[PDB]
């Protein structure tokens, strides 16, 4: 059941939690046998820009360059720049694809982020015929750990900032989801910059602990593409039908899709239902 | 009442129709007497990666490095790399930022978000003491302009990749809100590369002449901090009375505010209520 696992870091300092959180990680699938990869995008000095550089040979049409087109064709192509396909042949060797990272502006790091719009290119992440559920990845899984400055309570529903969930969404859903990722639950560390000694070791040792069963967890629960008319035609809307019956429903599907309805629970921060 | 405005763009070919919509505002501003200000990311050749050469001078700790605090103080201590400061220069002259980019990966683009990790420094653009409505720019007034490849459709409600009010909500309330900014409406064009000819002209009149008022326009509806005990005492949660009296309310206030219930509607599409 146990293979390989690729554990993207984006965290400048070796001297940070979120190192440790790295670490520990690796550490811990090691000694359950795994097969640890890593793509330290910060230390590998990885190029987060996209540009028409990301191409190798003839660009085709280099007069009205459009960057989806001319890339999920040099894909195909095998013309895809090396750094890009370092990582490609990475994930495809992953069975499960950890990113660990400090919450940044309600987002993801810019370089982390760039190695999204880099990465995950078209042909090879997705297709608009292989969405979500149909997706190239529906037999990877993968997660979030997070490292937050500001406190719990602070993304609670009468915080400040507001629901988590709906920050993790656009990239739970919108990223991960989308590619056909099986999206299991964030591991959300708050303000360690307040927590003692104490706390961050044990908060280690919960990470460890964690891992020696990631691989049997239940994934977060995003509304199945069954309930869509996956065409240009429909539009990509939610069956007829199945609005028809979801009428009859208080609740909304997930925290994108809440139908207008009161969302859920923690969709998006917990796995169950 | 017009004044200084400020429009960041974030594509790297000229013959794109964010370029289009990059030119079409400043042309319509310079006609209304305005003063524009760029900062064509991929041109600058600007840096999106945050690292400690942000810094000059003495980096204080540089053993336990810590970019927010190393930066907080270096920009008080005006010690802060020259690029990030021609930035500040510009936000400190603008009473408007435009930002214009293609939606990518349910977000802002790379580059731009590097921008805002590096160029939005706390002390400057934000400050615990000095949150959302209490921000340094509550000033100034913003807006998105995004081009989607998907579909308008797509983001309804009913749509495959879920409400868009969502998607927006961590820019719009994360970065511009937090900073103080007062979010207009986002100007969004769905999938131009199937659009014709003709509408792609339309858009951009619209475009225009849409710029000839927007000082004049109402902002997006955040929830006020005012209903909020911000210290870290309480937790920056909804004062009990404001829960109190908001459980007789049907719907959630914003998109992070659901409070559990029905989520008002345009919340983050349309200013008004
Ligand atoms: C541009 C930008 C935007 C941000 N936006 C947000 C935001 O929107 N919301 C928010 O909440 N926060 C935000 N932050 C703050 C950010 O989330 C925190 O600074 C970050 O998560 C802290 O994680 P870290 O791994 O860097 O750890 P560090 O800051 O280094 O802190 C780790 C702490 O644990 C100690 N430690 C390190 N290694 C170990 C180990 N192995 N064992 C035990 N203890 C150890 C360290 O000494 C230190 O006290 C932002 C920061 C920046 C720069
Ligand atoms: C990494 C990545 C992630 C993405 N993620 C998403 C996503 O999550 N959701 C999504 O919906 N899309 C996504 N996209 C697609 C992206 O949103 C579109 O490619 C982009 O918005 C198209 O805008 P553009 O300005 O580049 O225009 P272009 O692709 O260049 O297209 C402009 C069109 O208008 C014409 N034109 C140009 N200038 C003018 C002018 N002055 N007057 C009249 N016509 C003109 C052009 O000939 C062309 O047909 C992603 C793309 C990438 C690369």
């Keep these: 059941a146990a293979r390989r696992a690729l554990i993207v870091l984006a965290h400048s300092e070796k001297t940070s939690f979120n190192y440790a959180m790295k670490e520990a990680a690796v550490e811990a699938l090691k000694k359950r046998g795994w097969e640890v990869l890593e793509s ?7 190029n987060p820009i996209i540009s028409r ?15 989806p087109s001319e890339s ?19 994930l495809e060797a992953a069975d499960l694809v950890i990113f660990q990272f400090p919450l940044q502006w309600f987002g993801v790091p810019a370089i982390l982020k760039g190695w999204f719009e880099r990465v995950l290119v078209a042909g090879f992440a997705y297709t608009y015929a ?3 559920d149909n997706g190239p990845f529906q037999n990877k899984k993968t997660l979030l750990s997070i490292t937050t400055g500001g406190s719990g309570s602070m993304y609670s529903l009468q915080g400040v900032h507001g629901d988590m969930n709906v ?18 639950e964030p591991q959300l560390v708050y303000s360690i910059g307040h927590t ?3 706390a ?39 069956m007829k039908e199945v609005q028809e019956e979801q009428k009859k429903n208080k609740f ?3 925290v994108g899709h809440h139908l207008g309805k009161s969302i859920p629970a923690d969709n998006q921060i917990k796995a169950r239902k």
Tied chains: 1, 2.
């Design 252 to 254: 909304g599907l997930s």
């Design 130 to 132: 292989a969405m979500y």
């Design 72 to 90: 999920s064709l040099a894909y195909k192509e095998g013309r895809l720049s090396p750094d890009i396909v370092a990582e490609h042949k990475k």
């Design 200 to 238: 961050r070791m044990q908060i280690l040792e919960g990470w460890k602990k964690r891992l020696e069963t990631v691989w049997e967890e239940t994934p977060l629960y995003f509304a199945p593409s069954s309930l869509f008319d996956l065409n240009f035609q429909a539009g990509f809307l939610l």
């Design 40 to 46: 330290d995008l910060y230390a590998m000095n990885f």
């Design 167 to 184: 920050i993790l969404w656009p990239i739970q859903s919108g990223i991960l989801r989308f590619c056909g990722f099986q999206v299991l």
């Design 53 to 67: 550089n990301d191409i190798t040979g003839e660009l085709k049409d280099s007069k009205n360059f459009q960057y």
């Design 196 to 198: 003692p000694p104490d």
